[model samples]
Target: DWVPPEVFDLVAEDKARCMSEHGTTQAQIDDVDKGNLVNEPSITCYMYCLLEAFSLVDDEANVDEDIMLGLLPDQLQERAQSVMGKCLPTSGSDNCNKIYNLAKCVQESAPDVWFVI
Candidate 1:
């Protein structure tokens, strides 16, 4: 299964808005997608922004599992579930760090799972 191009278009639109709000840079987002994660606010906050805007995570940092599962291709759900079970209940000193932590865990478990659009 694959992400449809239309879905990417949605991400692209939202991506700009999130970037603007967070002062995120495209280079950093690209770095994240390439698996070069850092604890920088510019990047991590943008990640948080995207997730929150998409209704994937709450302000308190709880990732909504059902909504997340629904966002994936059917065949990827089982693997995604496994990764989420291990990585979820997002935790850190702050929202951005929490999302950074979440991204790290997901990336470690399933390299293809966490990527910036």
Candidate 2:
């Protein structure tokens, strides 16, 4: 039920960069409700782009929960953490798989909160 304000601008910038590099945008990301982006390479790439931009994951696709939670307000951190649970991957050899699994986890764990993004 809460959204971090800075996420808007940060997402906007990230989306714009995705458009420049891959010509994909939120529309592609919103194409389906359940792990659909994984089926679309462009959208999957865009997902990685946003994740990197937000410092949600490292270049190797390892999630940095602390950095990710730090991006939000303290008031919302607990909610974010609760939603995250053990959904994040420890590390990954494949970035696409990492993003796909993370997206699926978020969609299943907190649909309402995840959709806001």
TM-scores of the candidates are 0.93, 0.75
Q: Per-residue lDDT for 46 in model 1? A: 92
Candidate 2: where are CA atoms >4 Å away?
A: 32-38, 90-93
TM-score for predicted model 2 compared with the true structure: 0.75
lDDT of 2 at 52: 83
Clashing residue pairs found in predicted model 1: none
Query: Against the true structure, whose TM-score is highest?
Result: 1
Question: What lDDT does each candidate get?
Answer: 0.87, 0.68
How many residue pairs of model 2 clash at the backbone?
0
Cα deviation at 75, candidate 2, in Å, is: 4.7
Worst 10 residues of 2 by lDDT: 32-41
lDDT of 2 by residue, 1-117 (tens): 466566677678667886578667556766644435454557666777777887777877887888888766777688788777767653344776677667777777766656524
Cα error, residue 96 of model 2, in Å, equals 1.9
